[PDB]
Design a protein around this ligand. Structure first.
Ligand SMILES: C[C@H](O)COCC(CO)(CO)COC[C@H](C)OC[C@H](C)O
Ligand code: NA
Lengths: 226, 125
């Protein structure tokens, strides 16, 4: 696609989330860089409203799949970059097993020469002493398969996967993700064959940062077609 | 520190004379960002052979790991830069190194359809 040309080098990223979980209102701002030729993302996020009322790991999927690497044999299947620069809307429902759910709407597009992910998130029905509002999640992340299929009739994609969140007692909290992406522009997009993304994420801290924050390194590569 | 940041950005950009001057002026060859990425990671990833050699000759850690446990060799397997793989191995890179999710450079090569690189790596066991 013509959109993939915008990603051949290092692209600056801004992420801006406004959230409300069980009435707890919060905001997150992130900035960093994406290097899609290598499937590489590097971001730092800050809670601009004080302490984050939910665990940082629960927000990772919400907080730019256009920076996935599509290997040479898969380039025709990269919807995300084909939608650029006008971008796409990314919606999800995330069901935390035996707890509440997040619903999210994001616009991902170029604003000037920066890729910007702007999100609204609403969470409901969380248990006050459950793993999310009780902060029982380990500060860590697993490696996932993100399954993608075309919705040719609606000129976009449908996506589904479960995130595994390690709990401090050795259990695992599942978060079942239902996702749709829809182009913002009228231009043609690439509608993929079924495939998946293989994801890797690591979470850290900046020893110089005093605000509630998360350092995130990711590497993502598309797969499932030979 | 300031020199470290500049060294990272020169390595990513393939600015070989900038790398050489920064190191002559005392930049730490093993400087890393908050993501654990070093100059050698960046040069190996992008395939900048002369920069990789300069860094290694000045003592770049061939076994450095980012936050995900990727070594420069892991990153060189994404595009499959053979001359860089060769140099890294000649400087003692561990061909079997696993990232924090257990992946090797062989595994990365296969994911990317780098079939020839995968064959090379396999023969080194
Ligand atoms: C059907 C199954 O229970 C999961 O439900 C998914 C669904 C309805 O099919 C539940 O809301 C839709 O979720 C995905 C969409 C994109 O989310 C829309 C909005 C942002 O919550
Ligand atoms: Na947390």
């Amino acid at each position: 696609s013509k959109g993939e040309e915008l990603f051949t080098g290092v692209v600056p990223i801004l992420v801006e989330l406004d959230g409300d979980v069980n009435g707890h209102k919060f905001s997150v701002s992130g900035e960093g860089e994406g290097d899609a030729t290598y499937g590489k993302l590097t971001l730092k996020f800050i809670c601009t409203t004080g302490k984050l009322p939910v665990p940082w790991p629960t927000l990772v999927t919400t907080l730019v799949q256009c920076f996935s690497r599509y290997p040479d044999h898969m380039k025709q299947h990269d919807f995300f970059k084909s939608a650029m620069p006008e971008g796409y809307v990314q919606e999800r429902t995330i069901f935390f097993k035996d707890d509440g759910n997040y619903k999210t709407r994001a616009e991902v597009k170029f604003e000037g020469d920066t890729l910007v992910n702007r999100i609204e998130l609403k969470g409901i029905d969380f248990k006050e002493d459950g793993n999310i509002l009780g902060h029982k999640l380990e500060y860590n992340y697993n490696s996932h398969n993100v399954y993608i299929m075309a919705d040719k009739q609606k000129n976009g994609i449908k996506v589904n996967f479960k995130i595994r969140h390690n709990i401090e007692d050795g259990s695992v909290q599942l978060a079942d993700h239902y996702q749709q992406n829809t182009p913002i522009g009228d231009g043609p997009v690439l509608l993929p064959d079924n495939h998946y993304l293989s994801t890797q994420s690591a979470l850290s801290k900046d020893p110089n940062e005093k605000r509630d924050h998360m350092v995130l390194l990711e590497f993502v590569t598309a797969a499932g077609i030979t | 520190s300031d020199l470290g940041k500049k060294l990272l950005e020169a390595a990513r950009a393939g600015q070989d004379d900038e790398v050489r001057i920064l190191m002559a002026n005392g930049a730490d060859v093993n400087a890393d960002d908050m993501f654990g990425i070093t100059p050698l990671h960046l040069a190996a990833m992008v395939g900048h052979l002369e920069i990789v050699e300069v860094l290694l000759k000045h003592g770049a850690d061939v076994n450095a790991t980012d936050l995900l446990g990727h070594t420069p060799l892991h990153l060189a397997a994404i595009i499959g830069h053979l001359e860089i793989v060769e140099v890294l191995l000649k400087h003692g890179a561990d061909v079997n190194a696993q990232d924090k999710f257990g992946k090797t450079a062989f595994d990365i090569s296969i994911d990317n359809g780098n079939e020839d690189l995968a064959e090379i790596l396999q023969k080194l066991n």
